[PDB]
C-alpha cells in the first residue's frame, strides 16, 4: 500500500514534466508566426515614409484625408493640425476642400478652416492630419501612422487566409 502511493507520486511528477515540455513547445511556434507577421507590419512603414517624401503624389492623398475627416465630422467650422512641412501645401488647397465638402454633403461649403499654430512630431508621425471642430473638443485622428494601426486589427483574418490558404477542419464558413 505504501508502494502504490510512493510510485504514483513519481508517475504524476514525470507526467507533469512531459506535459510542461509539450506545452512550452507550442509557444515557440506561435511566437515565430507572430514575429513573421510583425516583419511585414514593420517593413511596411518604410514605404509610407517614401510616399510622404513625394510631393507630386502626396497632395491628392492629403486632400482626400482632410475631406474624409470633415465629412465624418459634419460641422460648419474646423481646425487642422498638420506637420510643419505641410502647412504650405494645405494653404494652397483651401478652396477645393471647401467646395468638395459643400458638394459631397448637401450643405453650403465650410466657413473657415483655421490651421493650428501647433504641430506634430517630425519622427513619430509621417503625414496625415488631425481635424477637430471650432471648440476643439471632438477629434478625428487620421495620421498615416494611425490608419495602419487600425488596419492591423480588422485585417488579421484576411491576412491569414492569404498566408496559409483556407484553414482545415473548419467546414461551415
Amino acid at each position: 500500500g505504501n508502494f502504490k502511493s510512493k510510485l504514483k507520486k513519481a508517475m504524476l511528477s514525470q507526467q507533469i514534466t512531459k506535459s510542461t515540455i509539450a506545452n512550452k513547445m507550442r509557444l515557440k511556434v506561435l511566437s515565430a508566426r507572430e514575429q513573421s507577421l510583425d516583419g511585414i507590419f514593420e517593413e511596411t512603414k518604410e514605404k509610407l515614409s517614401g510616399i510622404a517624401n513625394n510631393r507630386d503624389e502626396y497632395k491628392p492623398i492629403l486632400q482626400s484625408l482632410i475631406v474624409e475627416a470633415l465629412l465624418k465630422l459634419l460641422e460648419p467650422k474646423a481646425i487642422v493640425k498638420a506637420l510643419e512641412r505641410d502647412v504650405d501645401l494645405i494653404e494652397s488647397m483651401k478652396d477645393d476642400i471647401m467646395r468638395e465638402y459643400g458638394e459631397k454633403a448637401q450643405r453650403a461649403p465650410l466657413e473657415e478652416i483655421v490651421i493650428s499654430n501647433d504641430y506634430l512630431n517630425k519622427d513619430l508621425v509621417s503625414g496625415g492630419v488631425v481635424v477637430s471642430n471650432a471648440s476643439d473638443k471632438i477629434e478625428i485622428n487620421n495620421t498615416l501612422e494611425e490608419r495602419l494601426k487600425l488596419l492591423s486589427e480588422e485585417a488579421l483574418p484576411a491576412i491569414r487566409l492569404e498566408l496559409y490558404g483556407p484553414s482545415k477542419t473548419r467546414k461551415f464558413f
Partner: protein, 59 residues
C-alpha cells in the same frame, strides 16, 4: 523506488531534444513561405491605407 527514480534521470534531455527536433521542420516552413507572399500583402495593405472612402453616415 531508487530504480524507478533513477530510470527517469535520462528522460529529461532526450525528450527535450526529440521534441525540439520534432517542430524544427516547421519554423523553416514559416520563414520560407513568409518571403514568397510578403510583397503581395504589403502592396494590398498599402493600397488600402492610401485611398480613403469619403462617405457620409446615413442619418
Amino acid at each position: 523506488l531508487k530504480e524507478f527514480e533513477q530510470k527517469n534521470a535520462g528522460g529529461v534531455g532526450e525528450l527535450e531534444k526529440k521534441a525540439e527536433a520534432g517542430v524544427q521542420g516547421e519554423l523553416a516552413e514559416i520563414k520560407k513561405i513568409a518571403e514568397k507572399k510578403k510583397d503581395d500583402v504589403v502592396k494590398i495593405l498599402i493600397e488600402t491605407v492610401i485611398k480613403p472612402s469619403a462617405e457620409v453616415h446615413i442619418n
